[PDB]
């Protein structure tokens, strides 16, 4: 009864189902013939197999490819846009251009050597991506971590949340058209990266959480960098707001664009800022508190 | 005269040197280095540009001789600009100039 | 010291070239192109006539001529767009239903 | 020159129609209302028709180096305004069935009426060229107002390309005339010649190209081939306007041009116009012998009747009653064509979409629409030059003018073409009174029927008593 | 100014001749833009400075911008007519060629018999044209505005999409 | 050797010097846009190729020259080569009327700003030709949108300049800069100034009003150098039309003209760095509904004040 049951992570000319247990997890040998065949598929790439209808019946239904290569940090993906002039009438997103076999790797790494792979799930998140994996393994192991471990993990999760939110706000402001706040927000991200480099030894993928705690203790002097960042940040945030986020051109580009209510957010599984913008006060840190978020 | 023909020769040399500079740039770019249906809104806005451009040329001719035409010419150009703005209000109010409906 | 006859002859040459292009081309866009050529040749002839007599009248009727040319090109290209919308070809020999 | 408040009083119908254009455009911009915008258009046209009285009280004088207002301009302004009012009245029930915007029709009708007024008052090559274009372009829009209908799009394309060609021909002719003369006023087109040198080659060539453009706009042979196709493809109220107002205004400005120009009495232009008039009469009558559609038949009728008018025009310098003959003929032809195209428009309204055929099927019209059949057969008799009708009075005037100037070839052509016209007009009338195999109700349809009934009564009454029309045409005399 | 006038006229004639015989619409529009620039140079040679300025501003800057707009809207790549080349075969074009040659001969014979004192080429500035435009030619300006309004309304009504 | 021929040679050399300086200033202001964006974005910009980055432009020039010249196989070669040619020469000839000093002008035409309008129309042609000849759907669509933008703002470019033309009573550039002998035209023609600035930014395809993806090698360099030459031309034109041009109290006339022109070039860069890009429909609605009636009312009030003050 599925309307269009096709492959979504692999190309349609793929033999086998990779998450089955009898599938070889490792990479097969690269062959230039497969590369030339897939290049031929790209060059000769029919708006009927994708579930599209009205294949230029109004003599204005223009087709364009929005991806897959992108001049943006969100990654690589393709949308085929059908337009009446400038109006979108149908869109089929084609994803899987960033598939890494993370779950199949989860069946191929140990409980400890999988944490770097958890790091690169959402590569702007870092320790935030480490957090549910190590909490679930601690549920499997029966480990109740001490309160200092919870405090450290909450600190690093909030630091990486600030880093990711800064990248998101800068990227949105650059998408609207203002090109200075991305430079300033990346300077702030460099301050956060200085603190994270001091604590963990790595910038973006620290791989620092462990089963039952963290990799090392905090280095002697982290609080000075945290105080520097906490003094540095709010003035720059107010500068970002006044320079770009209260601009009426940005508001005209943003307000009333691609809106949905609580019903559409619930029926599509939308979570995070998109869910809470509809008035649904559902945050995991309050509804199902984890890792000592009740103490903040 | 002398100054007028000198300025004419200067303008001619300006044209010649500019054309030769662009041609020489393209020739040097070519020689050097190794080798290995749209909607009706575009027509509508271009047509509106054409019509308001010839009405603009009328205003161009008026504007350079305002003092020699007196208040009568001001009244006539006021009627002209009033018809211009009535046509503009008619175009806006019916959604002709709205890119999106 | 430019003869009026030479300017009028140039304008007449451009007019008859525009008329030939209007006749021999079945494409409606090339007929509109020919119409633009003929009305521009008429405007050039009037400019030559006004410059020979030393009057602004030639340039005034040039202005009226190009106002007509702009509006006629607007209407003709709108009709051409409509023709291409409802019959997908610009051959006017298809548009010959009324006869006799 | 300059502009005076007295000149503004003589400017009254032009200013009133332009103000109506602006008011109707702003009313469409406010809210698209069909009834209100049609009411505003007919109110403005009636206001101009009433302001003709104040123009007459102001006298006759030259309002601009371009415009000259006199009795002749008043008469032809009145004829064009009456044709525009009838076009609006016929167009409302037709536009009741039009699915797209119905409000631009009256705007284009008002702008074409403005061009007709300018042609009526024209005294200059600039004003003549601008008035011709100001009539033509709204007719480009009105002929293809039902562009989704294939026939109307065909007619609009044909009219647009051919009239752009004719306008460029006319423009090149004015260019050659201005190169020869140096003055663009009508009174000076050949003034700088003398001692029998009126047949200047460049002046004759410029007037020939002007004759090409005007004879296109008047459906004169051999620039006549557009007329049946454009008349058939256009909407029937547009056919009414294009048959009456455009032809009347362009013939009036041709009358002023050939009366005021010192080259108007050249024998070469006279012989060329005689050839064109002979060919126009004979050809327009002969092509309507075997026509089954009423629109093409009326187009060939217009060709023949403009040939008769041209015969009245050729004897302008030789005769003395030529202008009065043209005025009486134009009033009669206006009323007859208004009635005929009004019956066509009333029986072709409402517009039943671009897919359904707009065939007239005039056979057996009396047995379900008796009054329209009586009006239509009165028009068919009137176009034939049969007595009891005003068209006979116009034909009698054309014959008297031709007899006075000894234009015997034109008189014989008028008689032969009148006989051929008798045949096909009478065939149309008896077909109306035959038996058909198989066989609105608002006040605007009633207004259109009242208009065609009033035209029929006027044709009959001024056919049996033409003295008031002759007197009010002789009262409308231009400056000598 | 004499040599400029003759060279610009020759360029305009050659470009128009290339226009009426070319098969690519964009190349034809480019050649006609070249011809319009040449006729503007003809205007500047004769002292009609405002006419040449409006020839490039409007004729070679607005109207054929609209033509190029329509051509690229239609995506005219030479289909069903470029595969024919019918106008290049003699049986289509020789007849109109004799027609236009006879008309040109008649018009040239009429042109050669006029009084000709020559064009001095004294520059008629745009100020004088604007004075005459709002003096003796007031009603021409107002009714030309009405004419352009009519063309605007007609082209909007016909060239909609729906 | 005659004094008339000496004067002719001096005027020819003057025009050649003006042309070389505006072309060099356009290229070095591409470099200066990079450096000024670095200044406004809390960084340095290119400052390693030579002293302070002064030899950077030579490096991109050599890279542009010694690149593979590439024309698409299914494209029109003539139009593809022609579009950068027009985009360069049109705004170069638009600069050819700007008086930078008393006695330093290329052509003292009686049309002047009309010649600027002609050149702007030809620049629109350059954009259209670049979009069509690439044989790419993305470039064609982008050229359609960009050309409709430039039409929606050239519809009032001249009408914005008509206030200055009406006050000066002439089309000549030197008459325009002489009409501001006491008050600069930015004070009376302020609305004309803002509308002309908006239209000049829009017709130069500059931020925030911005088909180049198929161009490469020296053609892309020609496109960019033509764009920055258009920036120079529009800045110098607004200096001459609204800021007096070469007139000033103390400094030499070139010093005043160059300072005002460089200030407006820096204002171009600051406008690029600051403002976000509006949507298409709002941009064209602003061009049609707002700027055109503003220019018409500005011309009407300017004429009324001029005729009222003519005693
Ligand atoms: C040498 C030449 C270069 C000179 C450089 C200096 C001058 C540069 C001029 C740049 C002009 C840029 C103009 C941009 C206009 C954008 C108009 C627009 O789209 O506004 C839309 C926006 C929102 O509209 P709304 O209806 O609310 O949309 C709802 C949709 N959800 O509506 C709004 O946000 C309302 C305000 C619209 C814009 C008003 C005008 C602003 C102009 C830019 C700022 C100029 C400041 C002075 C700069 C220095 C001047 C010398
Ligand atoms: C002189 C003749 C004109 C008189 C003044 C007219 C003022 C504007 C009239 C009007 O109603 O403007 C409101 C209009 C609303 O925007 P629009 O999208 O057309 O509305 C669709 C449905 N509301 O918004 C507009 O029409 C936009 C503004 C257009 C202004 C044109 C010039 C007006 C005169 C100055
Ligand atoms: C060399 C071989 C051919 C090369 C390719 C073609 C290049 C263009 C050739 C034609 C145009 C330029 C001719 C040369 C003009 C040089 C200046 C000149 O002669 O000026 C004289 C005159 C100045 O005015 P005035 O005051 O009357 O002068 C009398 C002096 N007391 O000037 C005037 O009155 C007006 C001068 C003409 C108008 C300005 C220039 C117009 C250019 C139009 C170009 C059109 C496109 C050409 C494309 C060619 C390729 C197809
Ligand atoms: C790819 C190349 C294509 C071809 C490009 C052009 C090739 C030829 C270039 C050289 C031509 C000769 C130089 C031009 C003539 C200079 C003299 C001149 O124009 O004089 C006439 C007039 C003088 O006015 P002024 O002296 O102030 O008045 C006092 C009384 N005489 O001044 C005027 O009337 C000035 C107005 C006319 C100026 C014309 C300038 C060129 C216009 C065409 C640009 C083409 C751009 C490329 C193609 C675009 C797309 C097609
Ligand atoms: C620092 C700049 C100082 C400019 C002074 C100036 O313009 O002086 C010229 C003139 C003085 O009067 P005048 O009698 O001509 O004296 C000349 C003596 N030979 O004075 C004038 O002509 C008056 C000029 C007034 C200009 C006012 C604006 C100047 C620029 C301010 C910043 C502009 C920012 C962008 C635009 C925003 C809107 C204006
Ligand atoms: C709601 C419906 C729509 C309503 C309307 C909306 C649009 C409004 C548009 C308004 C436009 C106003 C333009 C006014 C211009 C008048 C000034 C002028 O042109 O004066 C001419 C005169 C110089 O002329 P003359 O003396 O002959 O000298 C020339 C030398 N041969 O000049 C002088 O002598 C100097 C005069 C200086 C005057 C300066 C002050 C007035 C102009 C600047 C206004 C600034 C406004 C700033 C923003 C306000 C808030 C928006
Ligand atoms: C010019 C004089 C009047 C001409 C005729 C005008 C129309 C009059 C119509 C009156 C009614 C006619 C009825 C005819 C009925 C025929 C019945 C035939 C039965 C075999
Ligand atoms: C087909 C129409 C034929 C009309 C013939 C008219 C004959 C008129 C003869 C006039 C002779 C005048 C001699 C002097
Ligand atoms: C499918 C329909 C095609 C129609 C093509 C029409 C072409 C007409 C060509 C006319 C050629 C005339 C040549 C000169 C004739 C003698 C001189 C004029 C008459 C005296
Ligand atoms: C953006 C600026 C473009 C300027 C182009 C013109 C350059 C001409 C160079 C002339 C230099 C001398 C000017 C006259 C003397 C007055 C100034 C003396 C100090 C430079």
Peptide bond into F108 cis (omega under 30): no
Partners of residue A88 on adjacent β-strands: A83
CB atoms near residue A151 (< 10 Å): 14
What sign does the dihedral E23-E24-E25-E31 (CA atoms) show? negative
* Separation in Å, CA F57 to CA A6, F27, F32, F52: 52, 7, 10, 12
Any contact of D with A, at least 3 CB pairs below 8 A? Answer: no
Fold of E1-159: 1.20.120
- With 0-12 / 13-18 / 19 or more C-beta atoms within 10 angstroms meaning exposed / middle / buried, residue E17 is middle
One-character DSSP codes across A174-213: HHHT--SHHHHHHHHHHHHHHHHHHHHS-SS----EETTE
The rounded distance, in Å, linking the Cα atoms of D1 and D62 is 9
Nearest CA to ligand 8 atom 12: D408
CB atoms near residue B33 (< 10 Å): 16
| 3-state percent breakdown (helix, strand, coil) of chain F, nearest 5 | 70, 0, 30
Task: Record the tokens describing residue D134, joined without a space.
Answer: 């100001």
Which of chain F's residues have a Cβ under 8 Å away from the Cβ of B86?
Answer: none
Question: Domain limits of chain B?
Answer: 2-94
Domain covering C4-87 in this structure, CATH number: 1.10.287.3510
Give the residue, out of E2, E3, E4, with the most ligand 3 atoms within 8 A of its beta carbon, to mutate for a pocket test. Answer: E4
Residue among E114, E135, E149 minimizing CB distance to D179? E114
Q: Are D259 and D190 in contact (CB under 8 A)?
A: no
Elucidated via: cryo-EM
Q: What phi and psi values does residue E48 have, to the nearest 5 degrees?
A: -85, 80
Reference D118, options E144, B24, F132; nearest CA is E144
Q: Which residue reads 């197999």 in tokens?
A: A49
Fold of B2-94: Methane Monooxygenase Hydroxylase; Chain G, domain 1 (1.20.58)
How many CA atoms lie less than 13 Å away from D331 in the CB half-sphere? 26
Any contact of E with B, at least 3 CB pairs below 8 A? Answer: yes
Question: Domain limits of chain E?
Answer: 1-159
**Three-state DSSP class for residue D460:** helix
Cα dihedral D240, D246, D252, D253 in deg (nearest 10): 180
Cross-chain residue pair D179–C72, CB shorter than 8 Å: no
- Taking the CA of residue E162 and the nearest CA in chain B, the distance in Å comes to 9
Per-residue HEC secondary structure of F204-224 comes to: CCCCCCCCCCCCCCHHHHHHH
Question: Domain limits of chain C?
Answer: 4-87
Peptide bond into D222 cis (omega under 30): yes
**Residue ranges around ligand 6 (CB below 6 Å):** F 167, 169, 179, 183, 187-188, 190-191, 294, 297-298, 301-302, 305-306, 309
Partners of residue C27 on adjacent β-strands: C91
Q: Does B41 touch chain A (CB under 8 A)?
A: yes
CA of D374 to the centre of ligand 7 (A): 7
The rounded distance, in Å, linking the Cα atoms of F179 and C61 is 32
E99 lines ligand 9 (CB under 6 A): yes
Cross-chain residue pair F208–A253, CB shorter than 8 Å: no
The rounded distance, in Å, linking the Cα atoms of D248 and D258 is 15
- Taking the CA of residue A196 and the nearest CA in chain F, the distance in Å comes to 23
Task: Record the tokens describing residue D190, joined without a space.
Answer: 């050949």
Q: Are D343 and D376 in contact (CB under 8 A)?
A: yes
- Taking the CA of residue C68 and the nearest CA in chain B, the distance in Å comes to 10
Q: Is F301 left (phi over 0), alpha (psi -120 to 50) or beta?
A: alpha
Residue among C63, C70, C81 minimizing CB distance to B50? C70
Q: Is E47 left (phi over 0), alpha (psi -120 to 50) or beta?
A: left
CA of F218 to the centre of ligand 3 (A): 29
C-alpha angle F130-F133-F137 in degrees, rounded to nearest 5: 95
CA of D266 to the centre of ligand 8 (A): 22
Looking at F184-311, list the stretches that DSSP marks H as alpha helix, in order from N- to C-terminal side: 190-203, 218-242, 253-274, 280-285, 292-308
Q: What phi and psi values does residue A163 have, to the nearest 5 degrees?
A: -60, -45
Q: Does E46 touch chain F (CB under 8 A)?
A: no
Nearest CA to ligand 9 atom 1: C93
D13-30 CB burial, b ≥16 within 10 A, e <16 = bbbbbbebbbbbbbbbbe
The rounded distance, in Å, linking the Cα atoms of A163 and A184 is 12
What are chain D's partners, defined as 3 or more CB pairs within 8 angstroms?
A: B, C, E
The rounded distance, in Å, linking the Cα atoms of E139 and E134 is 9
Reference D64, options C59, C46, E51, E141; nearest CA is E141
Q: Does B44 touch chain E (CB under 8 A)?
A: yes
CB atoms near residue D192 (< 10 Å): 15
Cross-chain residue pair C14–E1, CB shorter than 8 Å: no
Q: Are F229 and F88 in contact (CB under 8 A)?
A: yes
User: Which ligand 1 atom minimizes the distance to the CA of A253?
Assistant: 31
B47 lines ligand 2 (CB under 6 A): no
- With 0-12 / 13-18 / 19 or more C-beta atoms within 10 angstroms meaning exposed / middle / buried, residue A33 is exposed
The rounded distance, in Å, linking the Cα atoms of F141 and F128 is 10
Cross-chain residue pair D141–E157, CB shorter than 8 Å: yes
C-alpha angle D161-D166-D167 in degrees, rounded to nearest 5: 95
């Amino acid at each position: 009864g599925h309307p269009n049951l096709r492959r979504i992570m692999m190309p349609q000319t793929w033999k086998g189902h990779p998450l089955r247990k009898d599938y070889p997890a490792r990479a097969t040998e690269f062959s230039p013939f497969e590369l030339t065949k897939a290049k031929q598929d790209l060059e000769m790439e029919k708006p009927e197999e994708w579930g599209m209808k009205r294949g230029t019946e109004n003599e204005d239904f223009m087709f364009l490819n929005l991806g897959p290569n992108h001049p943006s940090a969100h990654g690589a993906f393709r949308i085929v846009l059908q337009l009446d002039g400038e109006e979108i009438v149908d869109c089929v997103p084609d994803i899987g251009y960033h598939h890494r076999g993370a779950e199949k790797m989860g069946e191929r790494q140990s409980w400890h050597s999988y944490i770097p792979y958890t790091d690169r799930i959402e590569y702007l998140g870092g320790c935030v991506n480490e957090m549910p994996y190590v909490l679930a393994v601690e549920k499997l192991a029966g480990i109740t971590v001490p309160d200092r471990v919870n405090v450290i993990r909450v600190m690093l999760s909030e630091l990486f949340r600030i880093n990711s939110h800064l990248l998101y706000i800068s990227t949105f402001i650059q998408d609207v058209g203002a090109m200075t706040p991305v430079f300033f927000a990346f300077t702030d991200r460099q301050k956060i990266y200085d603190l994270v480099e001091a604590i963990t030894g790595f910038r973006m993928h620290p791989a620092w959480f462990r089963i039952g705690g963290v990799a090392h203790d905090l280095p002697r002097g982290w609080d000075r960098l945290l105080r520097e960042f906490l003094d540095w940040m709010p003035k720059r945030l107010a500068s970002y707001e006044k320079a770009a986020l209260q601009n009426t051109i940005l508001k005209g580009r943003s307000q009333g664009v691609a809106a949905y209510g609580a019903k559409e957010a619930l029926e599509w599984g939308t979570t995070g800022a998109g869910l809470r913008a509809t008035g649904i006060d559902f945050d995991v840190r309050k509804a199902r508190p984890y890792s000592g978020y009740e103490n903040f | 005269s002398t100054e007028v023909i000198a300025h004419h020769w200067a303008f001619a040399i300006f044209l010649i040197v500019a054309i030769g500079l662009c041609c020489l740039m393209l020739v040097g770019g070519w020689f050097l280095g190794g080798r290995a249906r749209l909607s009706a809104k575009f027509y509508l806005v271009a047509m509106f540009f054409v019509i308001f451009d010839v009405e603009a040329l009328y205003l161009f001719a008026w504007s350079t001789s305002i003092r020699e035409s007196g208040w009568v010419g001001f009244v006539e150009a006021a009627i002209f600009i009033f018809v211009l703005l009535a046509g503009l209000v008619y175009l806006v109010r019916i959604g002709a100039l709205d890119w999106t409906p | 010291m430019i003869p009026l006859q030479h300017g009028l002859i140039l304008a007449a040459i451009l007019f008859v070239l525009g008329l030939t292009g209007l006749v021999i081309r079945r494409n409606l866009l090339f007929m509109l192109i020919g119409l633009e050529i003929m009305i521009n040749a008429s405007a050039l002839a009037f400019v030559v006539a006004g410059s020979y007599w030393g009057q602004t009248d030639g340039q005034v009727m040039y202005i009226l001529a190009i106002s007509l040319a702009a509006a006629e090109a607007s209407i003709g290209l709108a009709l051409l767009l409509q023709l291409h919308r409802r019959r997908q070809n610009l051959n006017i020999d298809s548009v010959s239903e009324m006869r006799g | 020159m300059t502009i005076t408040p007295q000149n503004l009083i003589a400017l009254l119908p032009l200013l009133i129609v332009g103000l109506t254009v602006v008011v109707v455009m702003l009313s469409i911009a406010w809210r698209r209302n069909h009834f209100l915008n049609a009411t505003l258009s007919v109110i403005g046209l009636n206001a101009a028709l009433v302001s003709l009285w104040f123009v007459g009280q102001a006298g006759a004088m030259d309002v601009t180096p371009l415009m000259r207002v006199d009795g002749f301009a008043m008469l032809y302004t009145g004829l064009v305004l009456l044709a525009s009012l009838a076009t609006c009245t016929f167009a409302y029930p037709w536009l009741e069935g039009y699915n797209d915007n119905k409000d631009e029709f009256y705007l284009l009708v008002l702008i074409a009426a403005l061009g007709g007024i300018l042609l009526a008052n024209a005294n200059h090559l600039a004003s003549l060229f601008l008035g011709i274009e100001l009539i033509s372009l709204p007719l480009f829009g009105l002929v293809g107002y039902a562009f989704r209908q294939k026939r109307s799009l065909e007619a609009s394309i044909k009219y647009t390309i051919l009239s752009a060609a004719a306008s460029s021909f006319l423009l090149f002719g004015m260019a050659l005339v201005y190169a020869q003369s140096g003055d663009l006023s009508f009174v000076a087109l050949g003034k700088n010649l003398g001692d029998g040198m009126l047949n200047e080659p460049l002046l004759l060539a410029g007037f020939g190209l002007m004759i090409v453009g005007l004879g296109f706009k008047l459906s004169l042979v051999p620039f006549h081939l557009w007329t049946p196709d454009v008349y058939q493809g256009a909407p029937a109220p547009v056919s009414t306007f294009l048959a009456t107002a455009s032809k009347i205004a362009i013939f009036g400005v041709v009358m002023r041009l050939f009366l005021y120009a010192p080259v108007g009495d050249s024998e070469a232009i006279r012989v060329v116009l005689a050839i064109i008039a002979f060919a126009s009469i004979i050809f327009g009558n002969l092509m309507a012998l075997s026509q089954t559609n009423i629109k093409r038949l009326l187009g060939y009728s217009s060709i023949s009747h403009l040939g008769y008018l041209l015969v009245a025009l050729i004897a302008l310098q030789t005769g003395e009653m030529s202008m009065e003959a043209v005025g009486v003929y134009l009033a009669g032809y206006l009323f007859s064509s208004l009635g005929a195209f009004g019956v066509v428009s009333l029986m072709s309204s409402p517009y039943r979409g671009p897919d359904a055929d707009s065939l007239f099927s005039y056979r057996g019209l009396f047995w379900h629409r008796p009054i329209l059949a009586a009006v239509m057969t009165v028009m068919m008799l009137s176009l034939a030059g049969i007595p009891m009708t005003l068209g006979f009075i116009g034909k009698f005037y054309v014959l008297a003018v031709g007899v006075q100037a000894h234009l015997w070839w034109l008189v014989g052509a008028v008689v032969v073409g009148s006989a051929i016209g008798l045949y096909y007009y009478l065939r149309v009338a008896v077909s109306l009174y035959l038996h058909a195999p198989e066989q609105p109700s608002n006040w605007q349809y009633s207004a259109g029927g009242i208009v065609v009934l009033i035209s029929a009564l006027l044709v009959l009454v001024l056919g049996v008593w033409p003295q008031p029309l002759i007197s009010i045409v002789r009262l409308a005399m231009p400056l000598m | 100014m004499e040599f400029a006038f003759y060279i610009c006229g020759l360029i305009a004639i050659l470009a128009t001749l290339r226009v009426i015989t070319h098969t690519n619409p964009v190349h034809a529009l480019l050649y006609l833009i070249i011809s319009l620039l040449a006729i503007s140079g003809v205007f500047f040679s004769l002292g009609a400075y405002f006419a040449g300025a409006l020839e490039i501003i409007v004729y070679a800057g607005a109207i054929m911008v609209l033509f190029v707009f329509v051509v690229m809207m239609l995506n005219l790549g030479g289909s069903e007519i470029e595969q024919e080349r019918q106008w290049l075969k003699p049986q289509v074009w020789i007849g109109p060629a004799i027609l236009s040659a006879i008309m040109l001969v008649v018009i040239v014979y009429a042109i050669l018999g006029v009084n000709d004192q020559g064009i001095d080429g004294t520059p008629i500035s745009a100020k004088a044209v604007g004075i005459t435009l709002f003096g003796p030619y007031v009603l021409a300006v107002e009714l030309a505005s009405m004419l352009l309004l009519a063309g605007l309304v007609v082209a909007f009504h016909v060239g909609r999409e729906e | 050797i005659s004094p008339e021929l000496i004067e002719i040679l001096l005027t020819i050399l003057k025009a050649v010097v003006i042309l070389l300086v505006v072309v060099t200033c356009g290229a070095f202001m591409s470099f200066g846009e990079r450096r000024l964006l670095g200044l406004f974005q809390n960084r340095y910009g290119p400052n390693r190729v030579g002293w302070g980055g002064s030899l950077q432009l030579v490096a991109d020039m050599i890279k542009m020259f010694f690149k593979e010249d590439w024309i698409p196989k299914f494209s029109d070669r003539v139009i593809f080569t022609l579009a950068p040619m027009i985009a360069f020469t049109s705004l170069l000839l638009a600069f050819a009327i700007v008086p930078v000093s008393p006695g330093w002008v290329v052509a003292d035409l009686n049309i002047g700003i009309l010649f600027f309008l002609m050149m702007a129309g030809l620049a629109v042609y350059a954009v259209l030709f670049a979009g069509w000849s690439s044989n790419n759907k993305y470039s064609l669509l982008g050229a359609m949108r960009a050309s409709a933008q430039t039409l929606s703002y050239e519809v009032f470019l001249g009408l914005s300049l008509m206030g200055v033309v009406a006050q000066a009573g002439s089309f000549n550039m030197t008459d325009i800069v002489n009409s501001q002998a006491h008050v600069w035209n930015v004070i009376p023609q302020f609305f004309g100034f803002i509308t002309f600035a908006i239209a000049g930014v829009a017709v130069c395809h500059r931020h925030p009003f911005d088909y180049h993806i198929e161009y490469s090698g020296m053609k892309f360099g020609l496109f960019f150098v033509g764009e920055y030459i258009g920036i120079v031309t529009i800045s110098a034109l607004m200096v001459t039309l609204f800021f007096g041009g070469w007139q000033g109290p103390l400094l030499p006339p070139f010093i005043w003209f160059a300072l005002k022109t460089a200030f407006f070039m820096m204002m171009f860069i600051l406008i690029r760095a600051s403002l976000p890009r509006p949507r298409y429909d709002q941009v064209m609605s602003f061009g049609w509904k707002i700027c055109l009636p503003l220019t018409l009312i500005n011309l009407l009030v300017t004429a009324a004040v001029i005729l009222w003050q003519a005693q």
